């Protein structure tokens, strides 16, 4: 699945629609990033730029100009085609194929941007710019405006009003279209298949990074070349570290292993977290902590729908965590009192949900304490967890236990759709899965 050319145009129009007459929106592409010396990291396009263009190239600037309520055109600045640069690095689009390929009106050379941009801005009243996003962008836009302020003798005028378009654009990215939901849906299946794979390959003696390998390979097998974020494979005490990415330790029999890994498919992120026994059989202590986290997840999945909020559902989860923690001796006291004093924080110290989209931790306003009312189109993760420090003053059997069980969902008109439910989470199911795999 993917975003059709019709859709990028629709997005560009949706933004233009909100623009004031006599203005221009400048959206810059992401700079190339060094990994070491004359080596660069696999290029990743700025998410906002990509959202409107789907163009995976550096040194590109999309300009949307709006004259009035029905008159608007677009200018794209991108790299000039060049034969030496194309024999070495990859094929470029160039100004000639650009207008047709990217659905833009005019396509100029990036090398000409400083000679061209001020001409495009001259005479307008407003210019939408994400000031501070990129330093190279700030230099360009500022000198275009300084040329305009300084050239009144040449009859040039600079738009006195600058407006950040991020709030507007991010508010748009917050609500997914059916096309996007279809992409994310695939991102979910791919990530789910990867998680199922790790569970089936896991054996005591294997290193944590080995499961990172199996996960990344499965991503690749379905056309998702890169992970949306750095893979977490924390076994034993490592599972207590939220973003444990070193994955350097040998997975031992008896310990649990928490895998937090997601694929990047057509620019969209997949978040899945699954915790399971390295040996395929949960101990009673492990099962006791797991059940509380699983109930938090299952209940939240049941609760999430239009009308509620992340804050509201989180309350139901805190309640479940405290109740369960008291029953095991991890917490001591009256449930309602412990709740009121937020007694779960030393064990569950992060949010229950984040927006999900082009960025794992997607854009979009949450509202104070993430209280915003959920509406159809919003896509989020559902990820309860309990991390009992190795030196926590609680019954020994719970020390060094880290468990998270994260699903990705879409708020539908009546409830929500679970994009990552194709990878098992119930303990009997996880055990059955691992046992079936260990035959062969
Ligand atoms: Mn997440
Ligand atoms: Mn995650």
Swiss-Prot record:
GO MF assignments: aminopeptidase activity; identical protein binding; manganese ion binding; metalloaminopeptidase activity; metalloexopeptidase activity
Highest taxon in the source lineage: Bacteria
Cofactor needs: Mn(2+)
GO BP field: protein homotetramerization; proteolysis
Residues the record lists as binding Mn(2+) 2: 260, 271, 406
SUPFAM superfamilies: Creatinase/aminopeptidase (SSF55920), Creatinase/prolidase N-terminal domain (SSF53092)
One Pfam family in the UniProt entry: Peptidase_M24
Keyword vocabulary terms for this entry: Aminopeptidase, Cytoplasm, Hydrolase, Manganese, Metal-binding, Metalloprotease, Protease
Entry's cofactor comment: Binds 2 manganese ions per subunit.
Localization per record: Cytoplasm
InterPro entries referenced in this protein's UniProt entry, alphabetically: Aminopep_P_N, Creatin/AminoP/Spt16_N, Creatinase/aminopeptidase-like, Pept_M24, Pept_M24_MAP, Peptidase_M24B_aminopep-P_CS, X-Pro_dipept-like
GO cellular component, one term: protein-containing complex
Residues annotated to bind Mn(2+) 1: 271, 354, 383, 406
Family designation: Belongs to the peptidase M24B family.
Quaternary state and interactors: Homotetramer.
Protein name: Xaa-Pro aminopeptidase
Originating organism: Escherichia coli (strain K12)
């Amino acid at each position: 699945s993917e975003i059709s050319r019709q859709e990028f145009q629709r997005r560009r129009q949706a933004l233009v629609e909100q623009m004031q007459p006599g203005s221009a929106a400048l959206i810059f592409a992401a700079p190339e990033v060094t990994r070491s010396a004359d080596s660069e990291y696999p290029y990743r396009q700025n998410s906002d730029f990509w959202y409107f263009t789907g163009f995976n190239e550096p040194e590109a600037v999309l300009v949307l100009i709006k004259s009035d309520d029905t008159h608007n055109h677009s200018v794209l600045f991108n790299r000039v085609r060049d034969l030496t640069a194309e024999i070495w690095y990859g094929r470029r689009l160039g100004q000639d194929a650009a207008p047709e390929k990217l659905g833009v009106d005019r396509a100029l050379a990036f090398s000409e941007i400083n000679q061209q941009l001020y001409q495009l801005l001259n005479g307008l009243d407003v210019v939408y710019h994400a000031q501070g996003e990129y330093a190279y962008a700030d230099v360009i836009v500022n000198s275009a405006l300084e040329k305009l302020r300084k050239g009144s003798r040449q009859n040039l005028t600079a738009p006195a009003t600058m407006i950040d378009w991020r709030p507007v654009v991010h508010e748009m990215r917050l609500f997914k279209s059916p096309e996007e939901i279809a992409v994310l849906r695939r991102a979910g299946e791919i990530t789910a298949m990867a998680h199922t794979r790790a569970m089936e390959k896991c054996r005591p003696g294997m290193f944590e990074y080995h499961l990172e390998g199996e996960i990344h390979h499965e991503f690749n097998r379905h056309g998702a070349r890169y992970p949306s974020y750095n893979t977490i494979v924390g076994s034993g005490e490592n599972g207590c570290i939220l973003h444990y990415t070193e994955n350097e330790c040998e997975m031992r029999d008896g310990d649990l292993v928490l895998i937090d890994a997601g694929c990047e498919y057509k620019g969209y992120a997949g978040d899945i977290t699954r915790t399971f026994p390295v040996n395929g059989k949960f101990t009673q202590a492990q099962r006791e902590i797991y059940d509380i986290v699983l109930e938090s997840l299952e209940t939240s999945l049941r609760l999430y729908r239009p009308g509620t909020s992340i804050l509201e559902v989180t309350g139901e989860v805190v309640r479940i965590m405290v109740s369960g923690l008291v029953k095991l001796g991890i917490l001591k006291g009256d449930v309602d009192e412990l709740i009121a004093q937020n007694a779960h924080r030393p064990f569950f110290m992060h949010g229950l949900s984040h927006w999900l989209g082009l960025d794992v931790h997607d854009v979009g306003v949450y509202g104070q304490d993430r209280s915003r009312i959920l509406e159809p189109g919003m896509v989020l993760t559902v990820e309860p967890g309990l991390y009992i420090a190795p030196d926590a003053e609680v019954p020994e059997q719970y020390r060094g236990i880290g468990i998270r069980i994260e699903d990705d969902i879409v708020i539908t008109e009546t409830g929500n759709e679970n994009l990552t439910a194709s990878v098992v989470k119930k303990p009997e199911e996880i055990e059955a899965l691992m046992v079936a795999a260990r035959k062969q």
